[PDB]
Symmetry: C3
Subunit: 114 residues, 3 copies
C-alpha cells in the first residue's frame, strides 16, 4: 500500500518516528506486511480547507485490494486518529481518498504485479 499526506503543518511539527508509526499501523490495519507499505509526508504546504488556513490534510491511500466500505471507515478512524494526535489536525479538516488498484496497474521492480 501507499499512503500520502499533504498538510500545511510545519516540518518541525512532524514527530520523529511518524513515518515508522504510519508504516506499522497501516501494516496492522491493512493485513499487508510492513515491507510493502510506502509512506510520504508532505508538510509546509500551501493549502486551505473550507477557505480557512487552519491545520489540515489531503491524503490518499492506494492499495491492491483491502479497500471497501467498512475497511475505509476503519482506515479513516485510524488515520484521522493519528493526524489529530501526532500532527494536531482536526479530523474534520482531513480528506482521504481511497484507491483500489488493479495489480496490472502497479509497477514495481521492473515489472508489474500482474
Amino acid at each position: 500500500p501507499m499512503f500520502i499526506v499533504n498538510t500545511n503543518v510545519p516540518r518541525a511539527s512532524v514527530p520523529d518516528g511518524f513515518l515508522s508509526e504510519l508504516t506499522q499501523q497501516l501494516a496492522q490495519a491493512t493485513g499487508k506486511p510492513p515491507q510493502y507499505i510506502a509512506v510520504h509526508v508532505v508538510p509546509d504546504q500551501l493549502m486551505a480547507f473550507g477557505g480557512s488556513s487552519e491545520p489540515c490534510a489531503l491524503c490518499s491511500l492506494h492499495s491492491i485490494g483491502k479497500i471497501g466500505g467498512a475497511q475505509n471507515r476503519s482506515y479513516s478512524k485510524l488515520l484521522c486518529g493519528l493526524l489529530a494526535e501526532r500532527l494536531r489536525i482536526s479530523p474534520d479538516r482531513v480528506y482521504i481518498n481511497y484507491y483500489d488498484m488493479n495489480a496490472a496497474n502497479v509497477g514495481w521492480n521492473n515489472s508489474t504485479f500482474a
Copy 2:
C-alpha cells in the same frame, strides 16, 4: 471537492488570495458550499510540458459527483481562466485530471461519506 495545482511558477508569484478565490469559484461552479472545498497549490516545481520548461500546471479535481462530460468542459474554462489571470500560465500548458469519487472512498472526520 478537492482541487490541486502543481506548477513551476515560483511561490512569490502565487497571489495571497488565490486559495480563497479558488475556493469560492469552485463552490459556485460545483454547487457545493465553500466549507466542502479544499484547495492545494504546489509552486516551484520541477516540471516540463511538451518538453518546454515554460510556466505550466498539472492539476486535479476530485469530487463526489458533479463530474461528467459537460461539467468538466465547463470547469476547464473556469480553471484555465484563473490560472491564466493569476499565475500567467498559458491555457495550453495546463492539464487537469477529473475524478468522480465514490462516497465510500472518501475519508473525513474519522469515517467516510458512505
Copy 3:
C-alpha cells in the same frame, strides 16, 4: 500523457536533462508526440518504503489509452531502469501507478479531450 516521480533522493542528484530524457523516452514508449507529454520530478521528499528511508520513489503515469497489462510491464522496465540509472534508486523500491484516463476526464485548454 503525464508522469510524476516523488523521491527522497536530493535535488542535487537529479541530472540536468532528466526531464528531457523522460519526455523523450515517454514519447517513444507511448507513441504519443512529445508536445503532449508532461513530466514532474519532486525530490527531497520525506518518504519511507518498507520502513526504510533508503532511496525510493512513488510515481504515476496517467494517459488516455496506451495503458494495459503488457504496456505497463514495458513502461515499468523503462522507468525503473531510468530511476536506477539516473537517480541510483533500486527498482524494488519504486512503485508506479498506471491510470487509463477517460478522455472526458482530462481537461486541457478550456475543454476536455472527449
